[PDB]
Structures are given as C-alpha cells and as structure tokens.
Amino acid sequence: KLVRLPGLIDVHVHLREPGGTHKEDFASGTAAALAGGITMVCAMPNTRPPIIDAPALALAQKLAEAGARCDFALFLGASSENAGTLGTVAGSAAGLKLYLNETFSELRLDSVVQWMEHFETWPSHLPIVAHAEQQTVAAVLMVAQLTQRSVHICHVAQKEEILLIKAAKARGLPVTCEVAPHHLFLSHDDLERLGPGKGEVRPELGSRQDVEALWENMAVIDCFASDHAPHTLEEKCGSRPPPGFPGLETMLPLLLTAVSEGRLSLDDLLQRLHHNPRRIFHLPPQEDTYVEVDLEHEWTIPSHMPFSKAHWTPFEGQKVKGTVRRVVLRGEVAYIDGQVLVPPGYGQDVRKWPQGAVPQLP
Amino acid sequence: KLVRLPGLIDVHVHLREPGGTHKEDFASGTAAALAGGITMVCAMPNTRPPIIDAPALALAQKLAEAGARCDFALFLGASSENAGTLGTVAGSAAGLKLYLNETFSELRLDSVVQWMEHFETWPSHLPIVAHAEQQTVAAVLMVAQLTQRSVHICHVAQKEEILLIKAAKARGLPVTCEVAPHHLFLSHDDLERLGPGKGEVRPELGSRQDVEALWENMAVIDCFASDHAPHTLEEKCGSRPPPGFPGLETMLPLLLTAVSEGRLSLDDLLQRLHHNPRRIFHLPPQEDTYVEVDLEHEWTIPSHMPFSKAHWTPFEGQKVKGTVRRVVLRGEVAYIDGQVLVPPGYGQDVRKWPQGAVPQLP
C-alpha cells in the first residue's frame, strides 16, 4: 500500500548551470529532484557567472526553461554593487539570497552597512534569505529589525543557532528557518569515515549535541531543504576540496526513515517540505501533482545515487526505510521506480504563472 | 488598480442547514462567503439535527452539495455518546469540533474524561478544534498533552487566552489558534451602542485591553476565521437572545482597512486567511481561483449586508477602506460588484477531491 503525498518543494538547491555543468546541470539536478520526490526547486545564484544582475537572470531563466524537468524559481544574489538596481526584476525571482560568511568574490559583502542597504532597497514584500552562521544569525536578525522586515535563515546547523532563533520567535520577531538533512543525520562522529575532503561543508557538520538540539527543537524548524551542493568526487578528494554535499536523492528517504521510527510525524514532514515552503516563498500550487512512496521497503544507501552528477554521497552505508515509487507532475508521469520520464524542458518557472506572482499593494 | 489575492478560506462558519434555515442556508451563507472574498468554508456541526453521527453527516453532505455556491468541508461534532464510533467517516470531515463551554444538550460533554476519550479515539492524523474559553484553554491543552497530539483553539478573545497559547508555543507544544474579527474590531466599549441582545456572543466581547493584546500578539495568531453565527434581528432582540454575529461579508473589508493603516501587512493577512488554514486543516488548493480587491474605496458598513439572512450586523456604522470587486472560482466568475453569478450547487466537498484527503500512514 503506497502513501500519496503532495508535490514536495526544496527551497535550497545548487544546480550549477551556468558555468559548472560537470558538477550538475538543470537536467541532471531536476532528475535528481524528481527521484527524491521533489516537484519544485528554488535554485541558488552562486553560478558562473552569478545571478546578480538582469542579464545573468535572463540567461539563467532560458537555461532552466530548456533543461529543467521539474518546476522551479531562481534566486537573485546580493552583491557589493547591486543594491538598488534589482527592482525591475525582483518579482520574477524566488527571492534575494545574501552570502554573509564564506563565498566567492562576486557575492562577498564587505560591511553590515551593505546588508542594511539590501534590506532597505529590495522590495519589502519579497523574500530575503541568508547564509548566516553562529553570531552572524544574530547580526542579520538585528539588520532585519532595524529595517522592520522579515528574514529566513538557511541551513541551521548548531544548538546556538536554533536556540537564538527560538528566542527571537518567542519575542514575536518575523524570522523563519530551514534545516538540511546532513545536519540531522550526520555529525562530527562521521568525519573519520568521510575523511577531511568529503566532509567539507558550510555550515560544517555539528557535534552530536548539535544534532540532538535540532531534533529537540523541531517545533522551531519551519522547512527542510537539502542544500544540494554537488561537486565531483575528484574535486571533493583533491587538493582544495569545495564545501557541500549532494542531497536531493537522499533527503526524503532519510526523513521517511525518521517518520517510521516515530521521530516526527508524517504531518510534521509535510509542513516542512510542502506547506511552509509554499507560504514563506509565496510559491503556487502545482495542479495534478503528487508523489507515491513505499514506507516498508528497507535499503542501504549506495556509494552514489543514480542521477546527480556529483556521483558520490556522504550518506553511503546508512540504512533507510522509505522509497519514492512514482511522481506525477502536472498530469504526466515524471518518475517511476528509477526511471525519469519527462524530458529536459518539461519544467516551468513558477514565478511566470499568474498564481505565482507575489501579491503586493499597488 | 486591483490587487489579486488567492482564494481565501474561512475555517469557522455556521450555515444553519439542516434545521435553522430562516437564519441562513448553504445557498445564502456561501453567497455571503463569496461576497466577502471567501472561496472555501468549513461548516460547524451544531445544526438541527447536529452532525454527530454518520446519517447526519450524509444528509448534510447532500444539502451542501445541492446548495453551496463555494467549496466546503463539514465538521463532525463530539457528543457524550459518539467517541469511538466515527472512525469510518472521520476522514470525510473537516475535523472534529469539541464544544467545551456552553452548548446544546446534544453536544454537551459532561467530563474532561469524555474529552480524553475523544482525543484517544479520533484518528491521530485528523484535526481537532475546540471552543474553549479562559481556563478551558489550559484544560484542553492538558488533555492534548496527555494524549500526545495537537489541538486548534477556536475564536481566541482575551489577553489571558492569547498569552497562555503564547507560553505553550514557547514550550514547543503543538497548538494553533484563530481569532474572529469582532474580537479585533469591537470591545465592551461598543455594548452601549449594540445593546444587550445584539451584543450577545460567545466568547463575549473583550475589554479594550483584550483587543490591544490580540493585536500586540499577532505573531501568535495562526488564522483569522469569522465565526459567522447568523441569527435574525427578531431573535437577537427578543426575550432569549442567541449568541453570535454574522461576519462573512464584513471580515475581509475590516482586515483590509487594518492593512491600509499599517496595522498588519498584506502577507500577514494572507498567512491567516489562506496558507495557515490550508496547512492546519489539510485543505486542497483551488485551481483557477482568485479574488480581486480594491484597496482605495472608502465606504461605511450599512445596517445589513446584502446576502446573509441574519439581515443585521454589529459593525454597522464603521468606516472601512477595501472592497471585494470580483471572485473567480474554478474558472467561473462567481461574484462581481454585488452580484453572485454561480448557482446553488456549484460548490463541492473538498474532502472528496483526491488532493483533499488527509495523508496517513498505512
């Protein structure tokens, strides 16, 4: 007996096109999404070139429309030069992403004053998300309060971060957050198996106590999102390993395992992979779209999942219970038992749908 | 310039059919809903006969399918006899409603033990909502904790209730709540104008300090819902006035006025009349459905709104800014500038749609 779920949404993926297509492209990354039960993705802007101006967004839109197999929205990225310049295209993006810790030169912000300028100029009704680790969470929250608006914190990893967000929510502040599966199912204890290259990720893996704190504070977590960050094994094991893990194909199986163990309920999962993503990012429903899962089948994660070009996974060897059997996307069978059946280009930009525009006052 | 909103959802209406059709019926109450920008309603079970067993639910389903002009789900009601008997029909209902304070004999629960029995027997994945005033909020929260599940508190009216819910959410407890417009826009100060009959409602109107506390604690309010409770003027002004106000036609205009004054944002409103209702009650999207509003037009609420058979309103004389201009429901024009254009029977039971069933483990 299969369980029918709505179309799940991952608000944090890196699809690497343009400019890093040996790591992933729209076609391979959205195949990975469908195989993971994900029918809509929001793609980060740290591509090459990065999505920091209107021409780069226009190129990325066409590449996604031609390559994506599931539906999508594309983030814009904040830079040291573009505050006050994005107003005409802002509403066509998923939101604005701020890289407040480590990043590439083009996305680096030199001052908290530059963060303020973005919060002041980006349209007030549109989403802002931040990569913000440890005390940076408190700092960006202060900027949000000074500018009287909301913020969403990406990939929360540590006890100190989730407790700070919990304290802010207790004071009624408009902050939401997401947690990635590696910060719920891996810890420092796994670094000896993974090694120092494969284990590189930002935010870094937490301690066992960090992991325990995220589970204890599930009520504070608004979304799950993969931070799918594919790099090849050669890159992860080489002389200057880039940070990040692939995760689209493993996220739902890991979380279904936790549901079957009673660590959270099916509803808790659907709030965090469907309803809260929809409402925080103003993402539209997908007609005639659903995912059928088998909650009984036990399997062991292999050394690589079938679709991501990363061709490796940090979850190798973990035993899971739960598997995606079939995905229907807008009335067409998109995935069945390991086979993707919609071509590159089947996916659409949800911000172009009438129901996908963010409502605003005139 | 009109603003496009998604189809709004009111999770708390009394439509009086069967058995009280001089006060309202499915046809008139759903006309009132559409005129208020509401495209889906959840109807309470305290009809005559009340919806407390399978035969009564079957009758109500047919009356709604024949009379409703917008989409709907129907609540079941808890009684002193029906715990453990609703399992076959539970999933076809909006949820289970508990009347924990004043009510009719058939819906009266004699003991907190009977509340426990309902929490233990009603399927764990389906919604439970409670009419629970003052210390009853704490009492039903304790029952929810003892039985390890969630609860939703109807029409929160007082400072003491919203602060208790706030404290429970700070402890990570699974509780949500709704607030009705009369508890945001009327207070004891209005009882001299209204008089003692018209002013009768349960929960009663709060003090000015209660109203201020609800606004200050907006972050704690998950939903707005009208508690549309129509009675005729003759009944409200007679010797034994029944409690309740009509509210479908005035709820959105009142809240749009508050948006235009900066008391809450448009997003804050849409979370509370669209996204959070959807996610708490597992209500499906409505395809090709939207509401167009004019935020500039100032008008004064008259002595009765056009559609509700209540034919009176406690908001008479209030100045509002905001009006519903057009409603489209599943691809058909349903309302334009005071005219309803879909017939009785156009509305459907959303729990019969494949996407409207509540997901559960096998």
Ligand SMILES: O=C(O)c1[nH]c(=O)[nH]c(=O)c1F
């Ligand atoms: O794009 C990436 O690989 C990446 N990887 C990470 O581990 N963290 C990031 O913040 C990031 F942008």
Ligand SMILES: O=C(O)c1[nH]c(=O)[nH]c(=O)c1F
């Ligand atoms: O049905 C009604 O009129 C009604 N009216 C109220 O004012 N409160 C209730 O709890 C109720 F059930």
Ligand SMILES: [Zn+2]
């Ligand atoms: Zn990041």
Ligand SMILES: [Zn+2]
């Ligand atoms: Zn990322």
Ligand SMILES: [Zn+2]
């Ligand atoms: Zn009530």
Ligand SMILES: [Zn+2]
């Ligand atoms: Zn009621």
